[PDB]
Design a protein around this nucleic acid. Structure first.
Ligand code: ZN
Lengths: 97, 405, 48, 49, 149
DNA sequence: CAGAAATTGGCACGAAAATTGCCTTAAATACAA
DNA sequence: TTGTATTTATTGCAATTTTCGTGCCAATTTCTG
C-alpha cells in the first residue's frame, strides 16, 4: 500500500533522553551499509558515482528518487527492490544523508 | 616475427587508454610497489520541475487517496513534462484493489492543468489539446486548429499538406494561419523550469598559433607522471640480506620499467599529434570543408611507426584547437573522387551538403539528385546514394518532409 | 521557520488553508550533529 | 550528502577538506594491505603503519 | 556636496534624534540625484557536445521577449530593461539523444531547430533596472566575430 | 483520373581500411674454468 | 684463452573483422496529360 508507505516516512521519533558512550567495532559495523575500498569520488567520464568509492551508490543510496543506477528499475512501483545488476536499492535520494 | 614477452605487451597496452583510465590504472601499480610515488562550502537547493509540481500538489484540496495517486503521477514525469508510464502502471504502483482507472484519470486531468499547463501529458496530441482548451472561446482559428490536432496529426507530421486540404476541406489561407497557431504552442511544457549544467572534457593536446605557425604541446595539467621513492631506494645497499634487499631490487627494477613505458607513451602521443596537426593546417585556419582525406597509413609514414601503433594511440584522446575540442580520430575520414584526379573528404562533403540544404528554397526543397548535380559542378563526383547516406548521417529529413508554406 | 524540513511545508499549507497551527518536529541540523559526532567513534543516540 | 563536492563554473568538482582527509587514509590503508600481503621487509611496513 | 539653506529649530518631531527634514524643492531640483552603473557578463564556453552559441532565435521564447535583441542576439544600446528581460541570447547544445517515434513526431511538426538546444540566455536579475549604455564583446582569437563585434 | 516520372532507402557487392592476438626471445656483457 | 649465466632491447606482423562507396529495385510521392 502506497498510502501507508508515504505516511510512514514523515513520522517523528519520540524520546526523552540522549545517551553517549564508546563505540565498539561491532557497533561501527552495525551502523554501516558497506565498506569503502577505493579513494575515487566521481567518474568524470559519466559523472556518476564510482563503485566502492567515497560517493558510492550501493553503500550510501541512490542519486535519483526511486531510480536504480544502471536503469533497470526506475519507477515508484519497484520501491524497495534491490537491483541484481549493481546492488542499488530504489528509494529516496535523501537517504544519502 | 617479434618475440612477445608479457612485459612488452603491457607497455603496448598502455597506449590505447584514455587519461582517466590511465590514471586509474597507475594507482593500482602505485599501491602495489613501495618504491613508486606521485610527484604531487555547503551548497544551495534548486527547484526542479517535480519540486514545483509537488508544491502545487500539497496545496490542492485532494484527499488521502488522491494525493497518493498524484504522488505516483508526478513521480513518473521526465524533464520534458511528458508522462513516461501508462496509467496501468500507476494504478499498479498504488497497490490498492478498490481504486479504478477512472479515479486515476480524474486526478491526471487535474494535474495536467498545473503550472506549466500541458504538463504530465501522455503524448503530443494530448499536450496540444490541453493547451488549446485553456484558450478563450472567442479566438480565431481555434476550432480549425483543434480539428486537425484531434484528427489528422500524421498528415502534418509528414508535411502532407495536400491531403489535409482534402480531408479537412480547407483553403490556403486557413491552412497556414491555423498551422502557425499550432506552432505558437509549446511542444515541451516542462522545460520552463529547467535546471542543470553541461559536461566538459579536459583535453590532452593543445594546439595554438604562434608567429604564423601552429604549435602543439601536451596539456601539462592532465599529463601523468611518476617518480621513484628515494627513501626506500636508499635502503638498497644491504640493510639486511635475502628478502630485505631482494624485494627492493626487484621492485626498483619494475618501477624504472613503468616510468620508461609511461614516457614512451607520452612522446609517441606528442609526435602523432604534431604530425596530425601539420598534415591538416588547412582545417584549423578556415574551419571545416577544407579537411584532407588522410588515413592511418599516411600518418604511419612520416613518424615511421606501424599502422597498429597509430591505431592504438589515437583512441579516446582529445585535442583542443581554437575552433573546439575534437576526438583526434575525427581527422581520419574517407574520400571520393574529384575532377582533376584529386580526392575530396567525406567530412567536407557533409559540410557542403549541410550548407546547401540550409540555404534551399523552403517552398521547394532540394532532393538528392538536385544535390548530386549541384555538387557535380565543382568537380566532386558523388553518387546519389552516397549523398543520401551523408544526409541520413546528418539526421536531415528527405526532401518531401522539408517543404512548408 | 528555519530547519524542520517536514514542518515548513505543513506550516505553509496550514497558513494557506487559514489554520494557524504547527506540528513542530525536529530540526535537521541536530541529525547532522549526531552523524558527525558518531563518525568520530562515539556512540551517541536518542533513547526511549 | 553531509560532505558534498563543490560545483563551480567550468565543470570542476573541487575536492573538499573531508574528502581529501578520507582519500589520504584510504590510500595509506590500501598500501599497507598490499605490503602486508607481499611480506615486505619490516622497515617499510613500520613506516607505512 | 551642495549648499543648502538650513535652519536650526525643532519641527514637530521630524528632526528628533539626528533625523533630517528635507523640503520638496530639493527633490524637484534634482540636487542629490546620482547615477549608478552596473555591469553583467555572459560567457559562452565550449562543451563536449559542441560549443555554446550566442543567437537571436531562442527556441521556446516568444517574439515579444526577442523584441529588443538585434540580429546577433545582443540587446540594443539605449533599451530600458527591467525585471527578467533578456540581455544576451545564448543557447547551449543538448545532444546524443536516440530518436524515438514520439521524438520524431515532435521534431517534424516544430522543426529541428527547436530540438537539441537548451536556453542559457543572460537575463536581468530580479529587482534590477536601468538603461543599456555600453556593450563590450571579447572574442578569442580563431573564433569568427559576429556583426556586433 | 491516372499512368508516368521522381524520390527514397533496404540489401548486396568487392575492396579497402581498421582492429586484435600474439615467438611466450637474440645479442651484448661480465664472470668463471 | 673460451663457455656460459646474466642483462638488455623489442612500441611490430599477419590474420580477422569491420566499414567504405555505389548499384538494384521495390515502395511511396509527386506531376503533367
Ligand atoms: Zn541496477
Amino acid at each position: 500500500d502506497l498510502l501507508k508507505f508515504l505516511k510512514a516516512q514523515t513520522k517523528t521519533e519520540e524520546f526523552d533522553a540522549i545517551k553517549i558512550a564508546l563505540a565498539s567495532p561491532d557497533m561501527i559495523r552495525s551502523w554501516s551499509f558497506g565498506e569503502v575500498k577505493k579513494p575515487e569520488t566521481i567518474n568524470y567520464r559519466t559523472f556518476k558515482p564510482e563503485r566502492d568509492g567515497l560517493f558510492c551508490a550501493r553503500i550510501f543510496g541512490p542519486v535519483k528518487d526511486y531510480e536504480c543506477l544502471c536503469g533497470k528499475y526506475k519507477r515508484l512501483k519497484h520501491r524497495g527492490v534491490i537491483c541484481e545488476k549493481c546492488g542499488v536499492e530504489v528509494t529516496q535520494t535523501k537517504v544519502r544523508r | 616475427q617479434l618475440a612477445m614477452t608479457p612485459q612488452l605487451q603491457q607497455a603496448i597496452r598502455l597506449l590505447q587508454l584514455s587519461t582517466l583510465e590511465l590514471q586509474q590504472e597507475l594507482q593500482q601499480a602505485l599501491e602495489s610497489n613501495p618504491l613508486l610515488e606521485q610527484i604531487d562550502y555547503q551548497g544551495e537547493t534548486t527547484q526542479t520541475l517535480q519540486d514545483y509540481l509537488m508544491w502545487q500538489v500539497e496545496l490542492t484540496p485532494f484527499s488521502d487517496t488522491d494525493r497518493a495517486i498524484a504522488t505516483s503521477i508526478v513521480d513518473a514525469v521526465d524533464e520534458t513534462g511528458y508522462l513516461t508510464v501508462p496509467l496501468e502502471d500507476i494504478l499498479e504502483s498504488i497497490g490498492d484493489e478498490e481504486i479504478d482507472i477512472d479515479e486515476v484519470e480524474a486526478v491526471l486531468k487535474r494535474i495536467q492543468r498545473f503550472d506549466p499547463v500541458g504538463v504530465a501529458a501522455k503524448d503530443l496530441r494530448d499536450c496540444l489539446l490541453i493547451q488549446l482548451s485553456q484558450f478563450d472561446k472567442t479566438t480565431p482559428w481555434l476550432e480549425e486548429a483543434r480539428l486537425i490536432i484531434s484528427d489528422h496529426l500524421d498528415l502534418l507530421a509528414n508535411h502532407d499538406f495536400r491531403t489535409l486540404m482534402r480531408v479537412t476541406r480547407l483553403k490556403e489561407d486557413v491552412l497556414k494561419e491555423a498551422v502557425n497557431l499550432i506552432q505558437s504552442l509549446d511542444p515541451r511544457p516542462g522545460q520552463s523550469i529547467q535546471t542543470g549544467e553541461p559536461e566538459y572534457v579536459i583535453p590532452d593536446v593543445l594546439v595554438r598559433k604562434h608567429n604564423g605557425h601552429w604549435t602543439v604541446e601536451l596539456n601539462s595539467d592532465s599529463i601523468p607522471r611518476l617518480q621513484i621513492n628515494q627513501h626506500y631506494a636508499s635502503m638498497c645497499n644491504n640493510a639486511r640480506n635475502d628478502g630485505d634487499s631482494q624485494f627492493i631490487r626487484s621492485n626498483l627494477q619494475d618501477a624504472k620499467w613503468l616510468i620508461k613505458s609511461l614516457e614512451s607513451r607520452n612522446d609517441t602521443l606528442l609526435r602523432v599529434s604534431r604530425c596530425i596537426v601539420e598534415q591538416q593546417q588547412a582545417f584549423f585556419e578556415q574551419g571545416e570543408e577544407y579537411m584532407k582525406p588522410m588515413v592511418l597509413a599516411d600518418i604511419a609514414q612520416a613518424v615511421e611507426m606501424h599502422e597498429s601503433t597509430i591505431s592504438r594511440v589515437t583512441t579516446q584522446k582529445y585535442l583542443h584547437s581554437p575552433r573546439g575540442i575534437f576526438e583526434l580520430k575525427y581527422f581520419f575520414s574517407s574520400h571520393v573522387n574529384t575532377e582533376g584526379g584529386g580526392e575530396a573528404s567525406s567530412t567536407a562533403i557533409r559540410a557542403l551538403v549541410k550548407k546547401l540544404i540550409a540555404a534551399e528554397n523552403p517552398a521547394k526543397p532540394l532532393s538528392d539528385s538536385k544535390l548530386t548535380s549541384l555538387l557535380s559542378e565543382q568537380g566532386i563526383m558523388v553518387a546519389r546514394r552516397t549523398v543520401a547516406k551523408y544526409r541520413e548521417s546528418l539526421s536531415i529529413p528527405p526532401s518531401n518532409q522539408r517543404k512548408q508554406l | 521557520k528555519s530547519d524542520d524540513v517536514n514542518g515548513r511545508t505543513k506550516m505553509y499549507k496550514n497558513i494557506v488553508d487559514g489554520n494557524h497551527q504547527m506540528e513542530p518536529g525536529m530540526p535537521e541540523s541536530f541529525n547532522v550533529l549526531l552523524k558527525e559526532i558518531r563518525s568520530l567513534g562515539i556512540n551517541i543516540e536518542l533513547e526511549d | 550528502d553531509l560532505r558534498p563536492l563543490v560545483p563551480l563554473d567550468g565543470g570542476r568538482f573541487a575536492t573538499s577538506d573531508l574528502n581529501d582527509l578520507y582519500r589520504r587514509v584510504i590510500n595509506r590503508n590500501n598500501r599497507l594491505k598490499r605490503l602486508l600481503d607481499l611480506a615486505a621487509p619490516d622497515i617499510i611496513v613500520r613506516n607505512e603503519k | 556636496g551642495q549648499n543648502m539653506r538650513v535652519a536650526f529649530m525643532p519641527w514637530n518631531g521630524y528632526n528628533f534624534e539626528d533625523s533630517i527634514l528635507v523640503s520638496e524643492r530639493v527633490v524637484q531640483e534634482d540636487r542629490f540625484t546620482t547615477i549608478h552603473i552596473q555591469e553583467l557578463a555572459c560567457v559562452s564556453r565550449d562543451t563536449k557536445l559542441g560549443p555554446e552559441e550566442i543567437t537571436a532565435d531562442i527556441p521556446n521564447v516568444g517574439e515579444a521577449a526577442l523584441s529588443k535583441l538585434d540580429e546577433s542576439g545582443i540587446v540594443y544600446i539605449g533599451a530600458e530593461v527591467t525585471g527578467g528581460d533578456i540581455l544576451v541570447g545564448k543557447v547551449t547544445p543538448k545532444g546524443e539523444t536516440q530518436l524515438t517515434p514520439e521524438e520524431k513526431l515532435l521534431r517534424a511538426i516544430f522543426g529541428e531547430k527547436a530540438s537539441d538546444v537548451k536556453d542559457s540566455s543572460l537575463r536581468v536579475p530580479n529587482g534590477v533596472s536601468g538603461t543599456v549604455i555600453d556593450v563590450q564583446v571579447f572574442t578569442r582569437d580563431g573564433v569568427e566575430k559576429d556583426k556586433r563585434a
